[PDB]
Amino acid sequence: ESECTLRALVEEYNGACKEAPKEMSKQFTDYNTFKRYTTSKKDHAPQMRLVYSVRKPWPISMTPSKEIPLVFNGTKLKDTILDLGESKRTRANIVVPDYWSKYGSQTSLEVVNAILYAEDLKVQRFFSTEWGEIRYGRMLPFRKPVQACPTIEEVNPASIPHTLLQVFCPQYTTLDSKRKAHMGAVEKLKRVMEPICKVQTQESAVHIARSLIDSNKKWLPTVVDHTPRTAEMAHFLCSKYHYVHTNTQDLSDTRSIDNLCGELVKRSLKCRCPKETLVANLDKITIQGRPMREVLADHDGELPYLGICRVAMGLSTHHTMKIRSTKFSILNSDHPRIEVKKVFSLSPDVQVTIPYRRFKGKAKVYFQNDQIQGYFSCTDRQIDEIKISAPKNAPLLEPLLDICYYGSFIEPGFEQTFGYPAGKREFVDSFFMHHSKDHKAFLIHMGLDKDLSLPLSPELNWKEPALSKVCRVTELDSTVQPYTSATREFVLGETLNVYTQHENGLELLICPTEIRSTRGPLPPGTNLSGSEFIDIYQDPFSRAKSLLKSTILHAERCKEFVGNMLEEYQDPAETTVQSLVPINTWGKSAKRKLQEEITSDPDWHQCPRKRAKMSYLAIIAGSIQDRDKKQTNVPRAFMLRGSQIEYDMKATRGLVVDTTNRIIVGGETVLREGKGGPEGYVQTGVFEEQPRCYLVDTPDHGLSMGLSRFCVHSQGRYFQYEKKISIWEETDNIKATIDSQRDLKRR
Amino acid sequence: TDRPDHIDSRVWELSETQEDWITQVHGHVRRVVECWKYTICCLISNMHTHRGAPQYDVFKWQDRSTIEWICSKKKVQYPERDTPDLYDNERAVAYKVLLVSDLSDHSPTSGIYHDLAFNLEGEAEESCALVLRGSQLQDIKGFLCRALEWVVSNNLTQEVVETISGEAKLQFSVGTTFRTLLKRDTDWDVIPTPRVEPNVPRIEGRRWTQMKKLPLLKEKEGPPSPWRALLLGADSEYIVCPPGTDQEAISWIHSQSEIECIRESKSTPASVITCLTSSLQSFAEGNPVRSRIHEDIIAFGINKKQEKKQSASSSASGEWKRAEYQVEEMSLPPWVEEEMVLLRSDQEDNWIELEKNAIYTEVDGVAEGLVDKYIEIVGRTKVASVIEKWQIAATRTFSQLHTDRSRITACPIITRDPSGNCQFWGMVLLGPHHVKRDTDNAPLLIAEIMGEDTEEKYPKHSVFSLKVEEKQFLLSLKITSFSRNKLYTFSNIRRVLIQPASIYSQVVLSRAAENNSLNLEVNPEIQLYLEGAQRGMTLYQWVRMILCLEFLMAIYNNPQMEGFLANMRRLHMSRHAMMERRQVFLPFGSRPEDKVNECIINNPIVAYLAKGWNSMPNVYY
Amino acid sequence: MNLFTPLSEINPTTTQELLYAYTGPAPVAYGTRTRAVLENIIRPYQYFYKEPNVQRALDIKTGCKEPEDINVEGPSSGFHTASVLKLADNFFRKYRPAMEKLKYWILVKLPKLKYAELSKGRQTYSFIHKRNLPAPIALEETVEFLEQNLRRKIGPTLLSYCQAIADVMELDETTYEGARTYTIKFSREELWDQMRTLNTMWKHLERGRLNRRTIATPSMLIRGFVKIVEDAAKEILENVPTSGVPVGGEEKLAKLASKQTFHTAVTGELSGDQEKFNECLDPDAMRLMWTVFLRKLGCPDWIMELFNIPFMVFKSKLADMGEGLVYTKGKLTDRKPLGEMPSEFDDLVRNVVGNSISCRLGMFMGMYNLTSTLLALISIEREELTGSHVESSDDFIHFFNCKTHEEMFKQAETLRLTLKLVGINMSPSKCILISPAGIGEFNSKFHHRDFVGNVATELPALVPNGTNPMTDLAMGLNVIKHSVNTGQMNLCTGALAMRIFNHAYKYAYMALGVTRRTRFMEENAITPLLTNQGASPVHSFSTMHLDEVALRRHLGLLDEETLRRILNPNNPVTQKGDPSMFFRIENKMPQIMEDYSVPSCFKYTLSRNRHKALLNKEERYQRVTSIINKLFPEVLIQEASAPGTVRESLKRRLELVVERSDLDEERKKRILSRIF
RNA sequence: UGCU
């Protein structure tokens, strides 16, 4: 029973105290030092003894057990003649495991399933991949770090220990540790290790879970546009002579996170000084229950908007400069790619300044597109050499023209017009179309030669024979691949431009206003209630729910919202409010009701029911009114625009329901009368002895009961969280102080 | 990064240039404490307003120009050395945030500003508590408790306490006598301060020459090298015994064996044939380990050390001098080419029976087909049978090792053809082996069937005549001592097949990849310098003789072979460069051939490789 | 060798695999190391002057030589002080991010370094037992020595350990008390000599060299000091383009490929080695380079002193001579010390200190691979050199992009001279330059169009490991898989290696032919069903990564009834001697302690068939660690931080576990009653 | 006492 474990622990503690009178006078923190003292497990050349060791009379050492017969069918399975130690001393014949393969006690099938869980996952993963057709061919390897094995959930390295602590020993954690843990991974890991922990020891299960949520990237030679997303199958699907075609999609939420980040960046560029707006909004948005900073840290993707948001949070980005379908990486350059504000005065009133980027000094850029791989060297706007490793007879139109656009080498466009300039995208499209139908600028820029050794044909094809050949274009003699030695650190511009710190300045890496990507689904569980952009939601129900959660749960936001709606001032949620209420004629009555409710009760912004009534009145007040219709009295309830959802002033039904016990907004209990934590908790105390208040079992256990004071245990210390009485968080008070300092500095 | 989680990113980046943290004791902890103080300052002025202006004005981490500008407007002046952290509009007086280890017995530090003292547990002193509101106290206590949790989690309690106290040790220091000990063997002190101005002088160098012609390896002069290897190699044969176990085969051999000496060597006396006969008789009964006899002392060199030392002591005369060990130089023997030619002879069996792996995918089928092709093109060859004999002999000699035996152990070398018949290559006799290390030698009596006898090739072998079933055979019967490590290495000799398989696989797969289709039956033409002239030659026979040369190289691996092969890689690369119209340039005193020639002493296969290098052209146009 | 030089299908670079005699025996060393040790001692003195004058070189403390004294036609021992200063300044001015990372490491990472990192080493010379001992044993005995001589406790950090080492040096007499009981005495001079003593010893089983070399090991009194400088050097080297030592495997190949850009008219590629490395490098040059790095970083004095301790200790090194030079009268063999009778090392008699010999020049040992790499890299930074350089320790490759051949030759000679300025001599017979680049070698990696795979560098790992059938099969198959992934072995070689490994692995466990195991299985009607039992292989080329048991279960080759027996967690074969603790996810009692066995019955333990007090102390430490792990599940995921000593910490933890056990109050009382 |  449960008492046997306590008995065993007590006897172990007593024996360790008696058998080791010293080794406990040391501090507990000395464990990190003396856990490594495990000598006498060392051995030398076990492989040079295996043949003899197996062929010894008694090779196997096991504990004394009665399940192994002394003699079975004339063979002596075990030997107890010597018994020098008599404990872990009896020796067994080499055939004992073979004997046990039969004639042995069995185990439940659940145990067998639990033991082979990860190996079975690997086997089904192998037998579930489509074994395609082998495509033999010469291949130029690309050495990159790739994930060793797939993970059930990707978590940033800082949050792995807290996730494991929440999975295995929640009773010895604090609320900060719980907040830093990935709760989705916690649930997945708990479900996975429920049967596994019954057959694996503590450390074995801990590190099995760690491996299930650890990336563990390793460098391997891969094939471009054939990345198997994991090195589990590289020996089968890849080599220097073949690949096996496979059809596997991403099945990852990185695309949705890109969509969310793109919406945030696009809406942030429309305000004043977008950088701090984006930073503040990223600190107020939560996907599922995880803060946006942590989920950005979790997903280290190649995508542009994800990279911009990761840089805004101080993290790194792996994004590479991409033109159409060709990726460019600067091997080394004298100066960063500069930009020229080429103004076009084609018309006096109609003039557009279209800026392009070029090189100054010498530079060497690696390019990759499909199977085409190589590098080129340039000086200023002149190409010196190009080396390409491409399959024979391949058309090199698009990669070469992407190179020309990247370096601004050919000069029909950029500084010129080849026709009136209007917008960046139109000019780029015209450039590409013009050079697609007229690709002679490359030939007049590079020159022609009659040598047959040069592989680039005048029609921009690889190894096709022709009378003339394109000069200074040769085959890639040696493998070339980008590699950065120093840890690149990125700089985010005030206009949300991602820069890389080059020696002589700043190198542009990601630049919005030309990142073309259509809108996509948002990540599930996204919470925009605390952010300034609720209109990102495309669903009226979600918009209304987020707006009402913002107003109800916080008094100051309700104050600001009511004030802006009543006085027609600019509000962050003007678009949402205008899109929620149909075109009506209740604005004047709503503003009136606001006036009498404010005058009658100056102390209204403390009862959530009053906040709900004021929010309803303000939402109607800030609605889009109709001109050619006389104003009417505000109704008790109205219907959301383009929907059958009812919003009610009395909050008896529909979108908001305020029962005596609790308030429900959009089917979710936002506020509970006595058991809730809307204002949060603060730590308030670390002690080595239990304080004078209740000790909860786990941090989440104390978060549900909602006591005024409770403690948690974590490595011999007690943390007694009580309550938050301040009406502001640390982040925005720090923001206010920093802005006040900088707004005294400006004079 | 290095930012603590509880520290805000803006505060962390603002603190980077405020103080030079590298020179301060516990610079990281000092920066963290300053960040704590600035965060406390931020929390004190938590969006408080007064007369349409912030209640508190924060001086901390602000440029001195603005500080003086706003202090002048407030009719207050503070000295440069100590400046208050913040100023309160209500109850007008300057405040400074202080962190103290003990809240008790604390007095104001300066008479120009007030002190807002806090302890590491978040508590505040009485005047600070009454000045500030309850919300500010709770915020400060919560932030300080989060900081304390971070401190105790990272085991930084002592560093934080020392930083808060104000005084701490330099975290490292060197005393006086230790400094004197250190400065004993150097002309500079602990932190050297040479008086010379930095400069990179110009030094007259030399000129880089060009390797216009490839180096010529030195061919040593001396007697031809004897066959110095554990077993016979290409001159190995076997007797086709009737099917049965090892005991039956040994009984059948011994019961019908007529042994007569035809050539006796001084190294191996002909009288130790009785040792082999006794071992055969004992193994034919079922007792592989037998007792010692009189001629076992001669056969296994029992106690030879004592008589050698006694003879040395009796003959000891003269003066002590240094060792000056010498290695006799030997020339390339004629039998190396014969060994290469004879090792390629075809056989009637495959001699490579490796169980096939499973086949699930098409890649698996391709790999197994390639392996089967390689096995069938190198299997039916004498070298494969010799490799099998070496494997069996080495493993059966190594398995009876690891013990301290004072008796004699017999280790037969028997293989079985795919018809049940036993094939008796020979027998290895293991003598008294009180082995303790991995390099100490174990005495052996290697007796095995010989195909052809040669005095110059086998000077230490005593060849006997074996008469079994109206057939005539030969017996080697050499006395050798052989170490544990070498026996273990030769127990895994089957790995030698990988490199010729590597060459074959690379050729086939390159042909498949260039034309984008697998063939698996290609037997192309390989251009090689056979007799000093480039002539075509098929891939299969090339792989066969590559396997033969690799096997001959493996069993003759020694320091000379290791150095030779390590130092020929540079010359191989230089030749490959020269064959592609590339020039090779060398430093002033560059003689890459000397580091190869120093490794050419007496190894017959090293000499064979050197002659092969010399024969092929050295100048490329 | 003509058979290894194809001309039509493949190139000799691909056949460089054939220039390997591996799978043959590796050479070993037999007798006295005294001659080799004395040769390594005398070589630095022979190279200081252009004309070898050993007697005039033994009185030199700091090896600093004028630029006109630097030998250009041979090895040159010593450095130019002004050259070192200027080149270190140039290397600091460039690669500013590397210096920023160095400052980050000094401020953040260095204080968190623990002296338990010293336990990761192999056999270490012990100044107490005058022998070679495993690193944990030597570290623990050194910690006890410091604790009982300084009368205080040593902090877990490495800085505290180094400070304790420095503090003990200030004492006049030090003593060591240890269980057998026995007491040994150290003076300041004796303990200083033991601090600066390197234990020399042969290097066995080394391939690729004709002559045997000697390796050395330092004591724990200086390994800690070397650890800081090595970690700082690694931090710097990870952020500089010209380094090649901190990266390895495929990352090193990617870094090399990033520099194989040949676009100018004359594009050379120089690949070579440095001759007489580790003995032409004065530690004072490394001192000066580190001092310049720390001065230009604004570092205080204490860190400079800490960084300079190890190189001075190596300036005062005492190399342990062997058991004597071999002398013969007739056919006798006697071993005599250096100074007994004349030899070729008579000039070094004055440096004899007991059985050890001093050497103020050179390093004598590769204890500063990263620092020597930094010293090599600082010399590269100069205006004349415009190519790409990669240096690991003493193997380097250089890529030239020059307009004319004469300019390339001038750059190559400038490279040679600037290497010689800091005491690094290019091996003339080992450095080869190809004027059109495209063919080269670095760390035995040959590239012509791409880095070609090198078979026979993976053959030594193809032998079964000898632990148990499951572990052996798993690790052999995964080694083969890694070789396939890295390009060393292709489809055919991979499958052939699989077959050879499988056949040897089945032989080693008595699964082929008629053996005792096979006979027992046959007479008792036990079908194998497993690879180690003689069954047909289940693993294929594409299934190298799959576990045997899971794959057999999936394919139906292993039925569930036998699975219920093989994977029994209660089998006697792999039963543990003590109970183990188990987690219980979402349970009233989250920890249950019970007897356990390794699930697989074929993961048995093979008996091995044959400072004792320190071993019992290790066992006591293991017991304390086991009880701490049982009572503190959270130290398995994060570092231990509970306050107080071990006894009180576990006492309160055991209590708190009891009051949450959900039992009766009086039962909790009776459980607490018997807690010591 | 049995590896092609």
Residue numbers in the entry:
A (entry chain C): 8 to 426, 428 to 755
B (entry chain A): 2 to 622
C (entry chain B): 1 to 180, 209 to 638, 645 to 710
Give the text the authors published on this PDB structure.
A replicative elongation sample was prepared using the non-capped dinucleotide primer pppApG. Cryo-EM imaging of the sample identified an asymmetric polymerase dimer structure (THOVPol-ELR-THOVPol-RER) and a monomeric product receiving polymerase structure (THOVPol-RER). The asymmetric dimer structure determined from the replicative elongation sample closely resembles that determined from the transcriptional elongation sample. THOVPol-ELR and THOVPol-RER within the asymmetric dimer show high similarity in peripheral domain configuration and RNA binding, compared with equivalent structures obtained from the transcriptional elongation sample. Therefore, we show that, starting from capped or non-capped dinucleotide, RNA synthesis induces highly similar THOVPol conformations. Without structural restraints posed by the primer tethered cap-binding domain as in FluPol, RNA elongation alone, starting from capped or non-capped short primers, is found to trigger re-configuration of the peripheral domains to allow the formation of the THOVPol elongation-reception asymmetric dimer without host factor involvement.
